[PDB]
Amino acid sequence: DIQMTQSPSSLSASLGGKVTITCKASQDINEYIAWYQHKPGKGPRLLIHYTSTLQPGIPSRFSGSGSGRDYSFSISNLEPEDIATYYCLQYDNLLWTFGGGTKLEIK
Amino acid sequence: DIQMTQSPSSLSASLGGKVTITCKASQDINEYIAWYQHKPGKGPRLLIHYTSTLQPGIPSRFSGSGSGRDYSFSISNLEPEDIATYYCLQYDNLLWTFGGGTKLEIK
Amino acid sequence: QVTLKESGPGILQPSQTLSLTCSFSGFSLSTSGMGVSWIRKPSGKGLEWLAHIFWDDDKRYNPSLKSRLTISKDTSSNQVFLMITSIDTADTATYYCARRTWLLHAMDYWGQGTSVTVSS
Amino acid sequence: QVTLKESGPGILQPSQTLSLTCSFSGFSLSTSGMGVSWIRKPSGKGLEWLAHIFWDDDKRYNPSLKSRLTISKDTSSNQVFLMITSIDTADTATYYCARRTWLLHAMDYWGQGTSVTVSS
Amino acid sequence: VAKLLLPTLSSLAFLPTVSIATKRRFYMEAMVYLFTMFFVAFSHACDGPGLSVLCFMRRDILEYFSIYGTALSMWVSLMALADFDEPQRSTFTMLGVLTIAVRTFHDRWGYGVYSGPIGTATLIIAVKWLKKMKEKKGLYPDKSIYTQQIGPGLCFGALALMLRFFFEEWDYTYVHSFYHCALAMSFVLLLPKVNKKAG
Amino acid sequence: VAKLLLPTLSSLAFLPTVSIATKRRFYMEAMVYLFTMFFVAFSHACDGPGLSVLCFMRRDILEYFSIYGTALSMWVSLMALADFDEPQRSTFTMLGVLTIAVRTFHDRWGYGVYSGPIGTATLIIAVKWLKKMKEKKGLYPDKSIYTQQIGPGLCFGALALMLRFFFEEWDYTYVHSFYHCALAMSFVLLLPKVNKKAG
Ligand SMILES: CC(C)CCC[C@@H](C)[C@H]1CC[C@H]2[C@@H]3CC=C4C[C@@H](O)CC[C@]4(C)[C@H]3CC[C@]12C
Ligand SMILES: CC(C)CCC[C@@H](C)[C@H]1CC[C@H]2[C@@H]3CC=C4C[C@@H](O)CC[C@]4(C)[C@H]3CC[C@]12C
Ligand SMILES: [Zn+2]
Ligand SMILES: [Zn+2]
């Protein structure tokens, strides 16, 4: 499979602060990397698609960048409603693979 | 460094037989792979250079082939004088690296 | 409005087979370019994708599980089924049913998931 | 005719420094495109390259050992020297001196090597 | 007087196309655009009675490489949009060069001199993207690439073609000067964000 | 009678060059050689009084693309020998195309039409290989590549140029037919064993 590896497995942060997650693909995935927010007892939410495109209705503090094996996702103005587990998804091939997940935490 | 890995670490064979050693480079080494014969208490001999060129005076049973990360070396009509340890050498960069070595043996 | 809802047996043992079902609304999956997929979160572990079923009744499976998954469709009642065979206690997970689209190829709507347990 | 001959102390301890010398003939290493290099076979292990010295008195060293090797030349007596500092018992090896050329860039003539031991 | 200088000066619309193509590591496309800019600029300068003293090559050479450079700019911008990998990239680049060279040399004013490059390049793109959509089971270039590059790029392209080949009979001096601006803007938009084969 | 047909038929010396270039994954070079073969074959057929009925394009088109194709074949064979990687490969390919096009169109019989391609391409090769020899501290292309490709390739190249531009005044019908064979053989030898960028 294509291996997706998120650099922080866990990430502790201040409320009102900013954080960044990075993910490395084992191949060039042609900027097809969706980013998901997962909360306990809820279905995940699509936040960002292609590489940088926010899903309609998603707050404009979420942003993601990068291309060719190196992709990044970030929460600015971090609210307590953003305390969640964040997964990326390689979706270049119909063989989908998720990143290992980053558990975000209040410091 | 560039990693050179010879597939047999040890190789047992009949006299008058034929054997093949293969070596994989971690990068494209542009066909700069010399092959050496090492005997106990003697300085090594250059058998083959670039990828396929036999050193002048070397018997024509020794032959090597391949290009771009995948290279092969072979002894035909294997004589007891060919019982030796065989190393490859990546020499594309002046950072030289040898293969792990193949200890040839009589079966 | 869009919705997916996963359902299953809850408790199994490794001799048995697992019959996951996924009711959905807002789409009927006879619509061109529409798709449904299965993803699972194993106990104390990150997400892994299982299976696809598309508008044209085309299908995909995870090479790691390809042998023991079969995905099916019923747009007469807006439902999709995943059958998982030859069970192991490694199959203890929450199983999510997620809706893919033609314009953005990643899944946009997930269900809340259903938990499955595999022990005596 | 071409020849290289390595020589050294034979026995050392890890506080000490190692003064390898290599006498050669058939070439003088003031000749354009000519080179000499050091390679070592550690005890029960495969070959590793250490250092280069070229016709133009240019030099190269192994990034893994670059700090504690210094290569020198004397074409007045057709000799090359390798000095290895800050010794460890990991340095127990046979040390080979090998002659590189301009037309084929790999080494063609080796010496028989010299053994070095690093223990109490 | 603006009537004389507008078709000469507005040919510098291609200079932003050269600098942007260079900046995105599209060096081979930047050669074709700079070659075009030079021969289009001097084709208009050499034609204009008030500054024809500036030109040094015959009118025949400047006119040929004005048309050839323009038609080849349309090919290499669409083949950059197509974004082929090797050995096809070099093969499709050479296919345009050799066929546009013979076509333009045979008759530089006959039909197919611009609709050949555009008609063929958009058919090559359509066949590639229809295969890639059947493969991915979804719209291949992201809705971003359609709404930012392909939509606006082909809109400025269509504007350039209808300015030059319909409206130009109203007043050449203004409409041909807007054609340079519309076509240069089309080449900027159709060219991708990064040359992924060299950056 | 052999006097008429020899320059027409011996142009098929380039067909082995096309098939060998195709076989080694040098597809863009195989286009230029096949384009050349076609226009050189028809340039001689259209010139020959006994079979001029065969040709359909004007003599001017066939003569131009005979010379242009020949000069571009000399460029792409030497740039294949040079073996640049991207973004320089596409840039050096386009540099030859655009400069040879203008040079040949300006004057197809003037000086520099073949010594431009060869003189510039061998200077680009010399600068690349002298940098690579200073880097490697040793003869860069292996003694194999000199004694098999560069030596024989430039010997058949030099033979082609002295047949066409010195000996041809003795008898055109024989010496020009040997020029096709010598140049086709030069293009086969100068072209590397594998297109490492596409195979
Ligand atoms: C990659 C290639 C195919 C790019 C496009 C090549 C273009 C420039 C050329 C090659 C042959 C040309 C055709 C040859 C003959 C004519 C007859 C003319 O009355 C109408 C246009 C038409 C039908 C041409 C259209 C343009 C054309 C297709
Ligand atoms: C990559 C490029 C540079 C390839 C070679 C371009 C060649 C075909 C052209 C471009 C300009 C040309 C020069 C322009 C003018 C003349 C004057 C003529 O009396 C002698 C030849 C000479 C000096 C030409 C030599 C060939 C030349 C250098
Ligand atoms: Zn114009
Ligand atoms: Zn000819």
What does the domain layout of chain A look like in residue ranges?
4-106
Dist CA F77 CA F72 (whole Å)? 9
| Secondary structure element (H or E) that encloses residue E116, with its range | helix E115-136
Q: Is there an atom of ligand 2 within 6 Å of F186 CB? A: no
Q: Can you give the resolution of this entry in Å?
A: 3.0
Does residue E177 lie within any of the structural domains? no
Q: Is there an atom of ligand 2 within 6 Å of F118 CB? A: no
Work out how many domains chain E is built from and give that number: 1
Residue with tokens 């030069």: F186
| Secondary structure element (H or E) that encloses residue C35, with its range | strand C35-42
Q: Is there an atom of ligand 1 within 6 Å of E116 CB? A: yes
Contact F91 E27 (CB under 8 A): yes
Contact D84, D69 (CB under 8 A): yes
| Secondary structure element (H or E) that encloses residue C117, with its range | strand C114-118
Dist CA B37 CA A92 (whole Å)? 48
CA distances in angstroms from C97 to A56, C58, C107, C114, F151, listed in the order given: 21, 17, 10, 9, 67
Dist CA A39 CA F18 (whole Å)? 63
Token reading at C118: 């595999």
A99 phi, psi to nearest 5 deg: -65, 165
Dist CA A58 CA A64 (whole Å)? 13
* Whether B and D touch (3+ CB pairs < 8 Å), yes or no: yes
Cα(F63) to ligand 4 centroid in Å equals 10
Token reading at D14: 């890890």
Which of E102, E80, E101 has its CA nearest to residue E150? E80
Contact C4 A43 (CB under 8 A): yes
Contact E106 F57 (CB under 8 A): yes
Size of interface E-F (CB pairs under 8 A): 78
CA distances in angstroms from A15 to A21, A36, A78, A79, listed in the order given: 17, 20, 5, 6
Does residue F198 lie within any of the structural domains? no
Does residue E169 lie within any of the structural domains? no
Residue F28, chain E, CB below 8 Å: the answer is yes
Dist CA F180 CA F13 (whole Å)? 6
Q: Which atom of ligand 1 is nearest to the CA of E100?
A: 8
Token reading at C101: 């689209």
Contact C46 A95 (CB under 8 A): no
| Secondary structure element (H or E) that encloses residue C109, with its range | strand C107-110
Checking DSSP bridges between strand A97-98 and strand A102-106, what pairing results, if any?
unpaired
Chains that touch F (3 or more CB pairs under 8 A): B, D, E
Dist CA D41 CA D6 (whole Å)? 14
Neighbours of ion ligand 3 (CB under 5 A): E 40
D83 phi, psi to nearest 5 deg: -105, 120
CA E5 to chain centre: 22
Q: Is there an atom of ligand 1 within 6 Å of E69 CB? A: no
The Cα angle at residue D106 between residues D103 and D108, in degrees rounded to 5: 85
Contact D16, D88 (CB under 8 A): no
Q: Is there an atom of ligand 2 within 6 Å of F153 CB? A: no
Our CA-based measurement puts residue E149 at a distance from the nearest CA of chain C, in whole angstroms, of 17
Contact D108, B46 (CB under 8 A): yes
Concatenating the DSSP letter of every residue in E124-160 gives: HHHHHHHHHHHHHTS-SS-HHHIIIIIHHHHHHHHHH
Q: Is there an atom of ligand 2 within 6 Å of F111 CB? A: yes
Q: Tell me the three state secondary structure of residue D94.
A: strand
Contact F136 B53 (CB under 8 A): no
Dist CA F182 CA F157 (whole Å)? 7
| Secondary structure element (H or E) that encloses residue D107, with its range | strand D107-110
- Rounded to the nearest 5 percent, the helix, strand and coil shares of chain D are 5, 50, 45
Checking DSSP bridges between strand A102-106 and strand A10-13, what pairing results, if any?
parallel
Residue B8, chain D, CB below 8 Å: the answer is no
Query: What is the arrangement of strands in the sheet containing D69-74, beginning at the earlier edge strand?
Result: D3-7, D18-25, D79-84, D69-74
Q: Which atom of ligand 1 is nearest to the CA of E75?
A: 4
Concatenating the DSSP letter of every residue in E15-53 gives: HHHHHHHHHTT-HHHHHHHHHHHHHHHHHHHHHSTTTGG
Concatenating the DSSP letter of every residue in chain A gives: ---EEES-SEEEE-TT--EEEEEEESS--TT-EEEEEE-TTS--EEEEETTTEEPTTS-TTEEEEE-SSEEEEEESS--GGG-SEEEEEE-SSSS-EE---EEEEE-
CATH architecture of the region A4-106: Sandwich (2.60)
Contact list, C37 vs chain E (CB under 8 Å): none
Torsion of CA D25, D31, D35, D36, to 10 degrees: 30
Residue with tokens 């002894």: B75
Contact E94 F32 (CB under 8 A): yes
Contact E13, E180 (CB under 8 A): yes
Checking DSSP bridges between strand A62-66 and strand A70-75, what pairing results, if any?
antiparallel
Token reading at C40: 């699972």
Instruction: Identify any residues that bridge with E130 across adjacent strands, giving them in sequence order.
Output: none
Does residue D91 lie within any of the structural domains? yes
Residue F102, chain B, CB below 8 Å: the answer is no
DSSP state of C13: -
Identity of the residue in F136, F144, F194 whose CB atom sits nearest the CB atom of B53: F144
Helices then strands, counting H and E runs in chain D, come out as 0, 11
Please provide the distance, in angstroms rounded to a whole number, between the alpha carbons at the two ends of chain E: 44
Contact list, B94 vs chain F (CB under 8 Å): 136-137
Contact list, B89 vs chain F (CB under 8 Å): none
Best mutation target among F134, F135, F137, F143 (most D Cβ atoms within 10 Å) is F137
CA E21 to chain centre: 12
Q: Tell me the three state secondary structure of residue C116.
A: strand
Q: Tell me the three state secondary structure of residue C100.
A: strand
Domain that holds residue E83: 2-137
Contact A53 E136 (CB under 8 A): no
Indicate which residue's Cα is closest to atom 19 of ligand 2.
F111
Contact F87, E27 (CB under 8 A): yes
Identity of the residue in B43, B50, B94 whose CB atom sits nearest the CB atom of D52: B94
Does residue D120 lie within any of the structural domains? no
Pocket test for ligand 1, best of E99, E102, E127 (most atoms within 8 A of CB): E99
Q: What is the largest CA-CA distance in chain A?
A: 38
Q: Tell me the three state secondary structure of residue C51.
A: strand
Which of F183, F142, F175 has its CA nearest to residue F32? F183
- Residue F20: count other Cβ atoms within 10 Å of its Cβ: 17
Instruction: Identify any residues that bridge with D20 across adjacent strands, giving them in sequence order.
Output: D82
Residue with tokens 């204009």: E48
- Residue E84: count other Cβ atoms within 10 Å of its Cβ: 16
Pocket test for ligand 2, best of F75, F79, F92, F103 (most atoms within 8 A of CB): F103
- With 0-12 / 13-18 / 19 or more C-beta atoms within 10 angstroms meaning exposed / middle / buried, residue C115 is middle
Token reading at C109: 């709507």
Torsion of CA E117, C103, A95, E86, to 10 degrees: 10
Chains that touch E (3 or more CB pairs under 8 A): A, C, F
CA B71 to chain centre: 9
Residue C105, chain E, CB below 8 Å: the answer is yes
E83 phi, psi to nearest 5 deg: 65, 60
Residue E55, chain F, CB below 8 Å: the answer is no
Contact C106 A91 (CB under 8 A): yes
Dist CA C58 CA E32 (whole Å)? 45
Contact B31, B41 (CB under 8 A): no
Q: Which residues contact E61 (CB under 8 A, 6 or more apart)?
A: F102, F105, F106
Size of interface C-E (CB pairs under 8 A): 18
Instruction: Identify any residues that bridge with B12 across adjacent strands, giving them in sequence order.
Output: B105
Dist CA E164 CA E74 (whole Å)? 14
Contact F142 B50 (CB under 8 A): yes
Contact list, F137 vs chain D (CB under 8 Å): 33, 35, 54, 58, 102, 105
Residue with tokens 């290499």: E76
CATH number at residue D22: 2.60.40.10
Instruction: Identify any residues that bridge with A48 across adjacent strands, giving them in sequence order.
Output: A35, A54
The Cα angle at residue F85 between residues E190 and B51, in degrees rounded to 5: 150
Dist CA F170 CA D74 (whole Å)? 62
Q: Is there an atom of ligand 1 within 6 Å of E103 CB? A: yes
User: Which method, experimentally, gave rise to this model?
Assistant: cryo-EM
Q: Which atom of ligand 1 is nearest to the CA of E95?
A: 1
CA F152 to chain centre: 15
Dist CA F44 CA F12 (whole Å)? 12
| Secondary structure element (H or E) that encloses residue C12, with its range | strand C11-12
Concatenating the DSSP letter of every residue in D1-51 gives: --EEEEE--SEE-TTS-EEEEEEEES--S-STT-EEEEEEEETTS--EEEE
Buried b (16+ CB within 10 A) or exposed e, D59-84: ebbbeebeeebebebebeebbbebeb
| Secondary structure element (H or E) that encloses residue F2, with its range | helix F2-9
Indicate which residue's Cα is closest to atom 3 of ligand 1.
E120
CA distances in angstroms from E122 to B32, E71, E78, F99, listed in the order given: 44, 14, 7, 28
Contact list, A91 vs chain E (CB under 8 Å): none
- Residue F80: count other Cβ atoms within 10 Å of its Cβ: 23
Buried b (16+ CB within 10 A) or exposed e, B35-45: bbbbeeeebbb
Q: Tell me the three state secondary structure of residue B36.
A: strand
Dist CA C117 CA F133 (whole Å)? 67
Contact E72, E31 (CB under 8 A): no
Which of F26, F19, F106, F21 has its CA nearest to residue F71? F106
Indicate which residue's Cα is closest to atom 18 of ligand 2.
F111
DSSP state of B55: P
Q: Is there an atom of ligand 2 within 6 Å of F100 CB? A: yes
Domain that holds residue D92: 3-115
Our CA-based measurement puts residue B2 at a distance from the nearest CA of chain F, in whole angstroms, of 16
- With 0-12 / 13-18 / 19 or more C-beta atoms within 10 angstroms meaning exposed / middle / buried, residue C67 is exposed
